[PDB]
């Protein structure tokens, strides 16, 4: 190890008539990146480099609040609203695979140990014309572990939240925000898992329940109004105290599912299965400027 | 009590806050931290690793065939073999590399690039090439007498099948940026051209067509600034599994 | 110098005369699980010379059209000798691996094999939302081939596979590649029958070519488990 806060300086260089020495000749077959220095390939000047390296720290690179969940539901009277619809609440299994920016940024490593900072942002809208105003409603977000039973209705007795961690917040207030610790039963999360989570040869491939945090049950604590509204809840996740291990090649093809790494490219290049990089005329073609 | 007043920016949710929030689970003890191989603390460690360039962007190259260029024996002298558009913040032979991918998360960059080529022909195959780098300002060199005037290296295939072409940091500014304009002065890096120095001479029992694999890395004087949202990924709809929100 | 190398593990030895070096994954050597990292409280087994030794696989061959081959670890060794016996009788294991790939051709041959050890190579399917099934991942001593080696069969890029512990077999330079793998896992031990820590991929980035008379050119893989510990002894499973 070594502490590097700025980029490295360049040193003055001279003519070389070196016999037996070949700095530019290397061996990619060993698996080592070439150790040719710029002072050994050209004649350099003394440059004192003052460019920092702070913004590429994995703490800076990963600790940014990103949308992980966005769910809209209807705040009305659901007596005759028979469906799988979210009556006045929803359950969400916490994952970081539903939105592709944070997914691709997190999947640059094999293992990650971080604390999650969860921010909930709720907006409301009238269903319809006949606008009369937007209500200041109180919501409840109960954190329920992955292997625990969750509420089945909005007026359930499960929302009494004996020991389940719960937060009550208003729409007119700043967004709700809590910190979830590093919850894994292992020393790091597994962003990737080439195994099956059961013993009976038919578990899901690639997902172990050790790495899912839990469920998030959000309801409207108020009882329904005489008119109906549509309520959108957005969840944001911000990793902190991050540790990253074993970096990986980035995802080039578009994601298909949140359950697996299944791939289908784009119809044509770029980012197609046939071609990731867009095509050019020939290898002697340059999209360059003439005069 | 304390007399206070609220400032502009009060009750706002900036996604780069860096504050302390309320612990949802009190008295929680995380799993003891053990040693795992390959810990990363700076993405500049990652960008310094070699990575294949897709120099064969042609429609006649499919899949893996885009990761190598084929050399042949020519019947003329001083002929051009290939070009490499040095656009890092754009799409090209450098976009799907480690340095390119990680840099496209950022707006500004500085420092020297490292270009390595491995000769993957026969043992009985011989030749000399010249890999040139041209600073920005003009057209890509199409003759060797024009390319030899920039930063170049002549290299002969031998026991070391690899050579390195340093692309030095020759800029006016401390950083280069991205604004989607290729011919911008704050963005254009120059060109990389390969010519035949002598020829590719193979025996009649070796394959007459031989391949180069190009790699690109970054040196330890490389840096990046002003994180972006990576135009290399995106969705127009929700993914397959939506359970349950 | 770096071209001559002898690896001696147990009652097995490998000599190679046209080599490059050997790689230590992330610059780390396999060890035994220390006391400040242990979780299982029963005494481990540690069969040293009976398990720490080279095992050779089925020696695939490559012609024109080859896309590449992969083996999952320890899945590829779960039925070979005393290592595969200790795996069937114990519940937890922990091991590093010494991998040695062999490929010989004449001095009139081309070809560049990329030998990569990928940690936790979760695979994906092509044109399907259904996840890969059990028989798609668990192949055993015979391994599988790549459908789309360009994306490493998971939607990533083969060009960037050089952050993983890798070596090249360029036929004009060397005929062998050796990578030393330590224990890579989030847990100190693991069930060897439902999870693989490593996947060894050999990919022909440059095709095999020559104008001499054609021979069969096989690619052989020798794997030695290193510092094997086994915990949780019970009866054997099939």
């Amino acid at each position: 190890e070594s502490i590097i806060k700025t980029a490295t300086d360049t040193v003055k260089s001279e003519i070389n008539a070196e016999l037996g020495v070949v700095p530019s000749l290397n061996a990619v077959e060993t698996g080592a990146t070439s150790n040719t220095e710029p002072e050994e390939a050209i004649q350099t000047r003394t440059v004192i480099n003052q460019h920092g390296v702070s913004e590429t720290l994995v703490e800076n690179f990963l600790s940014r609040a990103a949308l992980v969940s966005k769910r809209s539901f209807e705040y009305k009277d659901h007596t005759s609203s028979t469906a799988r619809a979210d009556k006045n609440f929803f359950k969400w299994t916490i994952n970081t695979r539903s939105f592709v920016q944070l997914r691709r940024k997190l999947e640059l490593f094999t293992y990650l140990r971080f604390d999650a900072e969860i921010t909930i942002l709720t907006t409301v809208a009238v269903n319809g014309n006949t606008y009369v105003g937007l209500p200041d409603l109180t919501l409840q977000a109960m954190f329920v572990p992955t292997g625990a039973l969750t509420p089945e209705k909005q007026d359930s007795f499960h929302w009494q939240s004996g020991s389940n961690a719960s937060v009550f917040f208003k729409i007119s207030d700043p967004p709700a925000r809590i910190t979830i610790p590093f919850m894994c039963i292992n020393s790091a999360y597994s962003v990737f898992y080439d195994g099956f989570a059961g013993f009976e040869k038919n578990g899901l491939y690639g997902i172990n329940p050790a790495d899912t945090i839990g469920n998030l049950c959000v309801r409207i604590v108020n009882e329904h109004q005489p008119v109906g509204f549509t309520v959108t809840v957005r969840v944001y996740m911000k990793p902190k105290h991050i540790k990253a291990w074993a970096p990986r090649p980035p995802r080039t093809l578009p994601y298909m599912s949140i359950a697996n790494a299944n791939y289908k490219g784009k119809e044509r290049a770029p980012n197609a299965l046939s071609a990731i990089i867009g095509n050019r005329d020939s290898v002697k073609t340059m999209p360059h400027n003439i005069v | 009590g304390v007399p206070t007043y609220l400032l502009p920016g009060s009750g706002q949710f900036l996604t780069t806050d860096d504050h302390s929030s309320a612990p949802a689970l009190p008295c929680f003890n995380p799993t003891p931290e053990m040693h795992i191989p390959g810990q990363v603390r700076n993405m500049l460690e990652v960008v310094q690793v070699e990575s294949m360039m897709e120099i064969n962007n042609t429609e006649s190259a499919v899949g893996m065939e885009r990761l190598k260029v084929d050399i042949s024996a020519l019947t003329d002298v001083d002929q051009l073999l290939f070009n490499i558009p040095l656009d890092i913040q754009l799409d090209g032979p450098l976009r799907n590399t480690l340095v390119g991918n990680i840099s496209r998360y950022y707006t500004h960059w500085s420092g020297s690039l490292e270009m390595t080529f491995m000769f993957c022909g026969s043992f009985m195959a011989a030749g000399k090439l010249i890999l040139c780098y041209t600073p920005p300002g003009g057209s890509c060199p199409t003759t060797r007498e024009t390319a030899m005037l920039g930063t170049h290296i002549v290299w002969d295939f031998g026991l070391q099948s690899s050579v390195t072409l340093i692309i030095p940091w020759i800029s006016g500014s401390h950083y280069r940026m991205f604004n989607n304009d290729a011919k911008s002065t704050n963005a254009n890096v120059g060109y990389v051209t390969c010519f035949m120095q002598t020829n590719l001479i193979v025996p009649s029992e070796s394959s007459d067509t031989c391949s180069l694999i190009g790699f690109i890395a970054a040196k330890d004087d490389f840096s990046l600034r002003l994180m972006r949202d990576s135009p290399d990924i995106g969705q127009l709809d929700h993914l397959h599994a939506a359970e349950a929100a | 110098s770096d071209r001559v190398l002898q690896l001696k593990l147990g009652n097995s030895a490998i000599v190679t005369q046209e080599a490059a070096n050997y790689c230590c994954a992330y610059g780390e050597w396999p060890n035994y699980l220390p006391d400040h990292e242990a979780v299982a409280i029963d005494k481990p087994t540690q069969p040293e010379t009976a398990t720490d030794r080279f095992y050779t696989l089925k020696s695939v061959k490559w012609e024109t059209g080859s896309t590449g081959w992969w083996w999952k670890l320890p899945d590829a060794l779960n039925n070979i000798g005393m290592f595969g016996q200790n795996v069937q009788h114990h519940y937890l294991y922990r091991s590093g691996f010494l991998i040695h790939v062999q490929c010989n051709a004449t001095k009139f041959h081309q070809g560049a094999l990329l030998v990569v050890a990928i940690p936790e190579h979760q695979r994906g399917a092509h044109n399907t939302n259904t996840s890969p099934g059990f028989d798609d991942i668990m192949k055993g001593e015979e391994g599988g081939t790549f459908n789309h080696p360009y994306v490493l069969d998971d939607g990533t890029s083969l060009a960037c596979a050089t952050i993983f512990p890798h070596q090249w077999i360029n036929l004009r330079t060397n005929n062998s590649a050796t990578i030393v793998l330590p224990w890579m896992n989030a847990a100190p031990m693991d069930f060897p029958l439902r999870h693989n820590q490593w996947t060894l991929a050999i990919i022909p980035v440059v095709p095999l070519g020559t104008r001499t008379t054609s021979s069969m050119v096989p690619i052989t893989v020798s794997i030695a488990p290193m510092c094997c510990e086994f915990n949780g002894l019970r009866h054997a499973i099939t």
């Binding site: 902190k240 105290h241 | - | 050997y22 230590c24 610059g27």
Partner: peptide, 30 residues
């Protein structure tokens, strides 16, 4: 400012400037 009793409630750790790039660039045994 951390008035919480838990350590993970603290703010992000933006001061870890140690790094070893040879872990990936030269993992050879030389």
């Amino acid at each position: 400012i951390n008035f919480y009793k838990d350590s993970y409630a603290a703010s992000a750790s933006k001061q870890d400037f140690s790094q070893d790039p040879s872990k990936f660039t030269e993992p050879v045994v030389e």
